[PDB]
Amino acid sequence: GSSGSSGGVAVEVRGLPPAVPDELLTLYFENRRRSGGGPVLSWQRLGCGGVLTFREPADAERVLAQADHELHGAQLSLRPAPPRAPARLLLQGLPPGTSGPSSG
Secondary structure (H helix, E strand, O other), X not given: OOOOOOOOOEEEEEOOOXXXXXXXXXXXXHOOOOOOOOOEEXXXXXXXXXXXXXXXXXXXXXXXXXXXXXXXXXXXXXXEOOOOOOOOOOOOOOOOOXXXXXXX
């Protein structure tokens, strides 16, 4: 069960050289010809990689689909990032939700 705001679509990027600017990193992913995704919401460059966010979920997958990724002479290892969203609450319990077939 979900309710409220929650993280969007993020993909964990691994094996990315610094010699390559984020600009390209996105340009590539954004390129439907090179990859086949769409617009990127945001990008978070980390040490040897960084977590990337794909505007669309399917699009994000459209890229992951490819186990191969090249950007400025280099092998980028894309993977499905883990879950994570902002929320600091603790509501003990859950809402209802039942169902059943019908008869005549």
